[PDB]
Amino acid sequence: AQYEDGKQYTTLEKPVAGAPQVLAFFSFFCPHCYQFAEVLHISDNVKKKLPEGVKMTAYHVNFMGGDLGKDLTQAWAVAMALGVEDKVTVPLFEGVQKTQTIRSASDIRDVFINAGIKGEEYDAAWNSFVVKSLVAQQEKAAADVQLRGVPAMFVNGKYQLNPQGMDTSNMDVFVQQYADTVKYLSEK
């Protein structure tokens, strides 16, 4: 008795086959997503508690931020294909919401260059078929879970995290409950 349907998580009435084990949706434009990444470190605490062999996957979404938003979804596809997610997450969140220095496709690419990805490697990745495929895959996954806002996280294409049923008086306690719920669900 400590993780309950309708409280810490909910059950998709419309389950999704072939979904990533643990699938997070976020936007670099989203203040809640910045809170999750930069203050709560949700993703990192989830990974710390996941059983062995369960992976976490994170997709960017487009319904925030207009054309930069779409650029950032493709830039995230680049990050996924070059395996540099953890080098650009922080400079992108801060670039968008904290200093607001990211305001065109060009400023996104600079974040990557300053994180070590050579400009020309970024460009090839940007125009590649694999990145195009990953942009469409992020979009297909969001439609498939009928995504209406971010942040959000889904386990085995069946369960949705419900932070609204979680204690938020203590940030550390919130983060452990959330991470413990993901771990619990990954084992259902």
Numbering used by the authors: 1 to 188
From the paper:
DsbA from E. coli K−12 (EcDsbA) was the first and is probably the best-characterised DSB enzyme to date. This 21 kDa periplasmic protein is a dithiol oxidase that catalyses disulphide bond formation between consecutive cysteines of unfolded polypeptides as they are translocated to the periplasm. EcDsbA consists of a canonical TRX domain, a hallmark of proteins involved in redox homeostasis, with an inserted helical domain. The TRX domain harbours the conserved active site CXXC (C30-P31-H32-C33 in EcDsbA) that is featured in many proteins of the TRX superfamily. The acidity of this groove originates from a cluster of negatively charged residues (E24, E37, E38, D44, E85, D86 and E94) that map along a buried channel in the interface between the TRX and helical domains of EcDsbA.
The other three mutants, E37A, E24A and E24A/E37A/K58A, were crystallised in space groups P21, P212121 and P2, respectively, with four molecules per asymmetric unit. The crystal structures of the three mutants containing the K58A mutation showed that the shorter alanine side chain at position 58 significantly expanded the size of the entrance to the buried channel. In all three crystal structures, a glycerol molecule, used for cryoprotection, was modelled into the electron density. Mutation of two or more of the E24, E37 and K58 further increased the “disordered” solvent content, reducing the structured hydrogen bond network between the charged residues and the w1–w4 water molecules.
